[PDB]
Amino acid sequence: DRVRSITLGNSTITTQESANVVVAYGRWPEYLKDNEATAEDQPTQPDVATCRFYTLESVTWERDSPGWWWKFPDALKDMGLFGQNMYYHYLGRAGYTIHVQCNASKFHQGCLMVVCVPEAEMGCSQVDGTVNEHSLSEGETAKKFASTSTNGTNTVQSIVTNAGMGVGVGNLTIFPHQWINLRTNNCATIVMPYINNVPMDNMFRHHNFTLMIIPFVPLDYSSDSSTYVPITVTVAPMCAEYNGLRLATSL
Amino acid sequence: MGAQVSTQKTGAHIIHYTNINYYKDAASNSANRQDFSQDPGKFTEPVKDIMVKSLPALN
Amino acid sequence: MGAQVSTQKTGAHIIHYTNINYYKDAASNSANRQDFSQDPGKFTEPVKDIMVKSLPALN
Amino acid sequence: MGAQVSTQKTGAHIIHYTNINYYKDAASNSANRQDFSQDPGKFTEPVKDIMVKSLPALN
Amino acid sequence: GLPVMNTPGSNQFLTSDDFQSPSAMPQFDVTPELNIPGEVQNLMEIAEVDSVVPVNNVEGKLDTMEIYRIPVQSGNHQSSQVFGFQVQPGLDNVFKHTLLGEILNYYAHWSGSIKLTFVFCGSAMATGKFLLAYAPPGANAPKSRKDAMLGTHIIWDVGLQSSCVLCIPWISQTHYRLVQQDEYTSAGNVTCWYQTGIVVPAGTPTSCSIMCFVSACNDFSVRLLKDTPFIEQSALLQ
Amino acid sequence: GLPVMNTPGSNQFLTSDDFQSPSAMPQFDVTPELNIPGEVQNLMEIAEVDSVVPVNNVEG
Amino acid sequence: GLPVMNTPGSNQFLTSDDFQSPSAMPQFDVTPELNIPGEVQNLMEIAEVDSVVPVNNVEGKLDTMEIYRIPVQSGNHQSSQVFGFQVQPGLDNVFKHTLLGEILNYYAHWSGSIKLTFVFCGSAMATGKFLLAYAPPGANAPKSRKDAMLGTHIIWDVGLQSSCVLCIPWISQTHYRLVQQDEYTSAGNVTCWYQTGIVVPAGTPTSCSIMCFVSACNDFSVRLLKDTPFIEQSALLQ
Amino acid sequence: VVEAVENAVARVADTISSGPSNSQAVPALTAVETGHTSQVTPSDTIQTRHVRNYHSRSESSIENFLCRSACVYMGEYHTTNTDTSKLFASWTINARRMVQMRRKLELFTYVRFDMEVTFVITSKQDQGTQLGQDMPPLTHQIMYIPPGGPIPKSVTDYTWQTSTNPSIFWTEGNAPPRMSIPFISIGNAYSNFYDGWSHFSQNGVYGYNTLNHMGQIYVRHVNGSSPLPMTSTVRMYFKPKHVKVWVPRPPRLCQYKNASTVNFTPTNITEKRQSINYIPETVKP
Amino acid sequence: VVEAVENAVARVADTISSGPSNSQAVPALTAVETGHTSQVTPSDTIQTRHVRNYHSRSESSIENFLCRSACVYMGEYHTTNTDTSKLFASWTINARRMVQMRRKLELFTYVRFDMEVTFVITSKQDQGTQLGQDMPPLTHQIMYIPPGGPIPKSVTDYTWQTSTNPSIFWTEGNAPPRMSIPFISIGNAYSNFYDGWSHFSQNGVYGYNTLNHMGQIYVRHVNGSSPLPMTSTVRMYFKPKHVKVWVPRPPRLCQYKNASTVNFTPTNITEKRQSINYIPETVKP
Ligand SMILES: CCCCCCCCCCCCC/C=C/[C@H](O)[C@H](N)CO
Ligand SMILES: CCCCCCCCCCCCC/C=C/[C@H](O)[C@H](N)CO
């Protein structure tokens, strides 16, 4: 009941302490069909060369950590053939399987929230100003929330209670989400379909969804337990499609 | 004359109304106030394996 | 068209009218002026044992 | 009463309307917006001998 | 022409009416409908989703995550109450900015049962039992475990299942209560007490925290729409 | 549009008329009806109840 | 009379409405209908007719026929590009006054595939091959035959059939693009290169010209009527 | 009695799936000299997927393209003046003075339809040193005169009796007047271009003004009033319906000059660019 | 012909009678880490009586929640002035300047509907030392311009011919004007939030202003009058109908700052109380 295995392409994930799997709105990923298509050229479907697990860089969960976020896509634009296909085409489409891992002993305590947010438009820490692209995303490196109000030009207002969006963070449960309670489980798994208002889109211009990881109960331990506790993310695209082949763009 | 007769909103514990469409576009029609459907499981129960609620959640 | 035809108030010693409902709520309908029921025994005869009125009340 | 009931313009992925004519002349009627015919070959293919489009045009 | 007569109400603009109106774009052709995931049909669907409650809303914590954490610890603390609050889902500070309270503040009347879920976030070696009690109105709030013992309550045992649900049932003399609650439409209170106590082995933290989620049951409804008092402006372009 | 003609009486307010009128609360959901004792249907029902007469209505 | 009530919109004049109206000439007898050749039923029918494109719209040629002629010649000119332009059928100077562009400028949204036909007007003894390429947007325009080789292209061989057709297919993330195109609704570019080169015998001219026609395919449509910016006046009587 | 009428919507063609090919069929090679436009699709030239297309060509039909009100004349007239001709407005009917409607109609050689005519009338108090009065609401009279009818000489001419001419009387503050007109021409269709003469010796009047001849419009105030001067403006709007058109033509390139002729000043084919290869860079950091 | 349509009302669930219990079924024990909300009722946790519940969730459906008129723009314009631009009003269409309607719409990520648009127009005599005149009733013109249309320069610009743009003419003293508008967007739905850029190099314009592009509105007086100055105010009201929405979001906590961005000032989670145990005494003599 607690064991799980997931296979995609030439990659496989096992786990012995999982809770369940969240299918975002009861909708599994799928390819675009004919009575919903607008673009006319025949699309390419690589199908094992792109649909497989890629692992990003880890972060260190310290006693005073506000939280982390990533933007998708553009966190996977340098990951093998998925990224190469992103560079050469005008239109792309894909769903995802996200898996978050964090293990600790039966003598530690803490609680993390793992949430996926579609169209997470963010605000600037200068009210009459605008954000730079660097402030929203550093590729495979995570951005970091703050515990107090922030200053600086072109940077995101990142105090963790407002989640960079002007809402109450305790309401983020309206989105697809799981929890990692250190006494209960050690991993979270979310399956996310393609969610947009058009059937396809350009993968450089538009961030489809943001992954947020926020500790609600801080990490705590006693006398001589282990101090280093990392968190790891692993994401696999699903049902990937591309249209509009031309010469490779450059940022 | 393409009339529609449907029931009015009343309480619980002569009650219908008639309507005619006059314009050629359906964007001119009145609001659709009498349709009451729901599907809450989309947001409250979005899990792969069904949870019975009389059984323990884990194990 | 969901019309209703009912009789008009007249005297004693061509007499009906038609009505259409236009609005979606029954709180928009006109008054109900032609219903004449009564139950006076609720206030004039509220006793447990029936009194015949030709017989003496007591004994 | 000589009413006409026809379908409204809608999209793809209760929808009809009624009309009455009041005037004695047809030049008083409303516009004819729901007729969509075509014959492009009159301007794009005005040739005597038919051209197959998979075969070469000449020879 | 046909003889007619105008009634009171002619030539007014009521902002909640429903009439037919001419189109300024005859025969416009709309974009086909796409089947996007996550379609919402009723606001009550949002109200049945749990959301975290800021129970620890005291001075100095209104802008930190500690506002969500209820503290508990080991030792003899049976006399100390854990928490208590009023049941006013649309008016009290504890509840008015959660998802349920946010939905309620667009309305004037509410009715139905409420769910409170409690989760224990200590180490896997901590054990303990708590008493969660709810008192209908008519008396003052209990000042001891013995008094609260007489209301509607559940005894929660911390184990491999980490979450307990206390349901507040609809006990009321009227069908609806006011979202802007007064003495007449009061609903009572909730309190928490130590049933046994928290016991831990050596090498484990001694202090821990509990969290609380709120949502609405499947008998819940609202009515009488109104504007919300949580948003405002001084001039246009805002 | 359809040709019409207004008659005397247009745009007046008679306090005993009976017309249809738009609702300022579309689709409001009313409280269910309760069966309370003592429902009155006609004023004559009150008139058939005896009541005491002040026959001795003299000064003092 | 019948009691009624007037709604908002009474007594206005909307210039796109459709109502019945009294005739100022009762029982007029119109002239019988004659069956004239060439009846038009849809504006798209005009859009599927080819028309010549002024590709060579450089300074000094805006009032001469040379604006329509693309020049080519023999010798080693593989490094030189023949032509290139953006795909903006209603906004770019190359396309806005052709029949298709003229029809589009009465509308706000367009969708569909486009046909470009190329005809070679050299002597019957000239031979050669050309590469015609189209690049969807997202990158800058190619600067060499090798880069343009990677897009959607056709290799045209000059022979007894004098005309080649390059079809631009509808590749877009939205169903419609704006006639007044911006960065968001861009569509890419077209370029031409020498695939082999032009070879001629003695006694023949060495320079030649190519012409280009544009038309719309059978999946093409427009919407959202508007006034055109190509006609104007300062006062009446014009 | 009710009668159901079924409307058929006409959507555009789908694209069919197509794979690789190596054969002798050459859909891409044509010959424009024939006068024939090639009917090729993307599926003949590339590999394509199957698409179900739901778009409709509804808003590009002639009826939807032409059935919209457009201004065709504006004029002014005073309540009091010392010229005797500035007290009423009059003109000859056509659609040649406002360029938008004219150019739109001139994409076709011949046209035939009915019309819906609307008038918009406004008034204003003339500038002066002494202002302020109490006038009743002004009333306006519009009379149409077919050719050969008697012409008014002033604002009190007997001809305003309008015994047989149709007229409209109107009061300010009400909805704009309107009436519909049938197809009235001695020919089988209206003619937008006429390459001919009025006289059998190939001289006289050239072109459009030979064939139109559709009467005049006169407009006056009815009150006969105004101790202090006032001015009114009348505007006319046309909307065609039940339309048919024949013989499409290339759209007008040069700007219009007058209402009687097709005269023009030579204009360029388009605007210039830097080079025959020039295309601007838009993907830059 | 008449056609009956049956409406199904959807009332809430009843509560079932329940007695004592002593078993291994544990409805009250759950695990929130799964992302699952518990579906328990009072009958699982206490003893209950049977109740027949007649309440309906009719007024919390999306259509009833959103179908109410709300103000979205207010503007002023004069009959006479020396600035030449204060004689007409104009703006770009959206629903982002008045906070109530904006916040209400922003509970959802994507929305699609038709609109009913109403205008409310009032006028007033400007303050001055010399008052008193006799003006006829004022008339107003409202013109909508889709993107790419010619823009008026003044109150006598030729562009007010409105040959193809839809316009409304209106006179003071009548009922407020109204018209309905269909769903007009090049996408499959309107977007309330857009986490992206306008340029393919990840710069340019950020967020909402990349996608809207729905034309402008212009409003003027028609009389061209007023010896003494006057001012008019126009207000616009929106009402959506035939609605569909997707992807709910948490409601806005911080106050709005401008109409182009989601920028905000950090705000508290709620307001404070004396203690985590504090609850006021209300039963006292
Ligand atoms: C009492 C008010 C009556 C108003 C009289 C308006 C009549 C207008 C004349 C009818 C003919 C107009 C029909 C169109 C004329 C031209 O043929 C077209 N503009 C194109 O040639
Ligand atoms: C002659 C008067 C015509 C009045 C013209 C009003 C047209 C208004 C523009 C139509 C589009 C409005 C529909 C709603 C726009 C936004 O998508 C929504 N506010 C939410 O995004």
Structure description:
The structure is cut from a larger assembly and holds one copy of chain A (251 residues), three copies of chain B (59 residues), three copies of chain E and two copies of chain H (285 residues). Chain A has 251 residues and is mostly beta strands. Chain A is built from two helices and 13 strands; from the N terminus they run ββββββαββαβββββ. In chain A, the strands form three sheets. In chain A, strands 3, 4, 5, 7, 11 and 13 form a six-stranded mixed sheet that branches. In chain A, a hairpin with a 2-residue loop joins strand 1 and strand 2 (11-15). Chain B is mainly beta and 59 residues long. Helix content of chain B is 7%, strand content 15%. The longest helix of chain B has 4 residues, at 41-44. The termini of chain B are far apart. Chain E has helices spanning 44-47, 99-104, 145-148; strands at residues 2-6, 39-40, 51-52, 70-73, 83-86, 107-111, 114-120, 129-135, 152-157, 163-168, 177-178, 189-194, 207-216, 221-225. The longest helix of chain E has 6 residues, at 99-104. In chain E, strands 3, 4, 7, 10 and 13 form a five-stranded antiparallel sheet that branches. In chain E, strands 5-12-8-9 form a four-stranded antiparallel sheet, with no helix packed on it. Chain E has one domain (1-238). Chain H has 285 residues and is mainly beta. Chain H has one domain (1-285). Helix content of chain H is 6%, strand content 31%. Chain H has three helices and 13 strands, in the order ββααββαβββββββββ. In chain H, a hairpin with a 3-residue loop joins strand 10 and strand 11. The interface between E and I is large, with 99 and 98 residues. Strand 2 (39-40) of chain G pairs antiparallel with strand 13 of chain H. One sphingosine (SPH) binds next to strand 5, strand 6, strand 7 and strand 8 of chain H. It is classed as virus. The entry lists the keywords Cryo-EM structure, echovirus 11, full particle, virus. The entry is titled "Cryo-EM structure of full echovirus 11 particle at pH 7.4".
